[PDB]
Design a protein around this ligand. Structure first.
Ligand SMILES: NC(=O)c1ccc[n+]([C@@H]2O[C@H](COP(=O)([O-])OP(=O)(O)OC[C@H]3O[C@@H](n4cnc5c(N)ncnc54)[C@H](OP(=O)(O)O)[C@@H]3O)[C@@H](O)[C@H]2O)c1
Length: 434
């Protein structure tokens, strides 16, 4: 198997990630001469459907396949196909009867679940099944990743970089398949701000990257590696690619009991509500300064990835799925909205004093809350954040495409509002965390 050592073995280079380190010579020689998959999509392969974004993508693609009597195939980690299907059923059994009925209605005719693993040869599938996917899949939608902001690139390489290369083997066999990929705004950690754009080739703007133990270094490197591999594949055979670099993915209001419990935003809301104390400001003071939180609700993101993804046109397109507005809606407003919805929060004016008292209050929480709180991430809040008026990244290509496709209720990128924050509270209560 390809490994971090065989490919990269303190700094890594985009040039390290040639497809010949992952895929056999014959597959690569043949890829330029293969036909494209049919542009009328009737079979979709979705990874990560048990994940937070992935389950919303599963709903999108079940709905889209219902219109054309098609099939959604979900790759799910499990010891058997039976267990895999049970895991995905359980994902949609969250205390919302309408969600469960909607999923069950669509899944009966349009869902296949396969046990497998992106990091394994042939995605962990037997040769007959793998060949069937190679022959039939019209689109790959790939949000699956090990999302962990502490592990090194050496440990995330398997699921996130090699995993991309394994899906590319499938995309480059029998017929060339469009590939929709989720990356992260975090790749910008090592890129000059003026060069970090939707138009750029990631190999040009991020040719060399450092490997170290800083926050999310490994994860952001691993997501960069996927983008680089996709660029290599596009050079070889022109496969359509859509890369969606996402900001923080927020919970959304349609379905009850659907939260990304381990993510840092959920941990923050739970921690504020449970301790009842917030800082005067989460941001550097001037007075409290105008600030913007760069997050988008998941139903919007799933719809945009689906509508604007690689099946929708030819070429290689990168989109910054970010919230660009200078709207003054930041973390301090979220505290105010928590307070206004019956989750009382007292402000401690001095940030340092707040942080010390907050740590003490977190340790006093009962186990279930404490384990899902900000306690393990407090190190990241040692200094207040510098406020930004909009996003750190440009969004012109994404915003134009969202407007042109008339996506969502705003026919535009949405703003965050109080109902999003209130949904965190009502879901945390439903899940027994408040
Ligand atoms: N959430 C965010 O704020 C955020 C921000 C920027 C980018 N993103 C990107 O958005 C995508 C989805 O994020 P998420 O928050 O939905 O993550 P998540 O909830 O942790 O879901 C991860 C999914 O990937 C699957 N997976 C992990 N390793 C795998 C492997 N070796 N083989 C097959 N499947 C594997 C997981 O399966 P199990 O259920 O078996 O673990 C799960 O279904 C990721 O690509 C992430 O980098 C997310």
């Amino acid at each position: 198997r390809p490994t971090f050592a065989s490919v990269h073995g303190t700094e890594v280079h985009a040039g390290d990630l040639s497809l010949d380190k992952f895929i056999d010579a014959a597959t690569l020689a043949e890829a330029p001469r293969l036909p494209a998959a049919n542009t009328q999509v009737r079979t979709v392969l979705l990874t990560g459907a048990t994940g937070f974004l992935g389950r919303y993508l599963a709903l999108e693609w079940l709905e889209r396949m219902d219109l054309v009597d098609g099939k959604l195939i979900c790759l799910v980690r499990a010891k058997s196909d039976t267990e895999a299907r049970a895991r995905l059923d359980k994902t949609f059994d969250s205390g919302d009867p309408e969600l469960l009925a909607h999923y069950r209605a669509l899944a009966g005719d349009h869902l296949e679940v396969l046990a497998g693993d992106k990091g394994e040869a042939d995605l962990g599938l037997d040769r007959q099944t793998w060949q069937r996917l190679a022959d039939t899949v019209d689109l790959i939608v790939d949000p699956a990743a090990l999302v962990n902001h502490v592990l090194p690139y050496s440990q995330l390489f398997g699921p996130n970089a090699l995993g991309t290369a394994e899906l590319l083997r499938l995309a480059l066999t029998s017929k060339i398949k469009p590939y929709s990929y989720t990356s992260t705004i975090g790749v910008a950690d090592q890129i000059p701000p003026s060069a970090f754009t939707e138009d750029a080739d990631i190999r040009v703007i991020s040719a060399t990257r450092a490997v170290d133990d800083s926050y999310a270094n490994g994860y952001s490197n691993s997501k960069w590696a996927g983008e680089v591999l996709l660029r290599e594949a596009h050079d070889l055979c022109g496969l359509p690619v859509a890369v969606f670099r996402c900001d923080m993915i927020l919970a959304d209001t349609t379905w009850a009991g659907q939260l990304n419990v381990p993510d840092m935003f959920t941990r923050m809301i739970l921690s504020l509500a449970a301790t009842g104390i917030a800082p005067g400001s989460f941001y550097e003071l001037a007075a409290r300064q105008r600030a913007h939180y760069d997050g988008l609700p998941v139903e919007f993101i799933a719809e945009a990835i689906s509508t604007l993804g690689a099946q929708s046109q030819d070429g290689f397109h990168t989109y910054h799925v970010m919230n660009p507005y200078d709207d003054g809606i930041g973390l301090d407003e979220f505290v105010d909205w928590l307070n206004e919805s019956g989750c009382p929060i007292q402000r401690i004016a001095d940030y340092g004093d707040w942080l010390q008292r907050f740590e003490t209050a977190l340790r006093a929480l009962p186990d279930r809350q404490r384990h899902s709180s900000l306690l393990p991430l407090l190190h990241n809040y040692r200094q207040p954040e510098r406020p930004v008026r909009g996003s750190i990244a440009p969004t012109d290509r994404f915003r134009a495409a969202v407007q042109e496709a008339k996506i969502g209720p705003d026919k535009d990128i949405p703003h965050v509002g109080a109902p999003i924050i209130v949904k965190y509270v009502s879901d945390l209560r439903l899940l027994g965390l408040l």
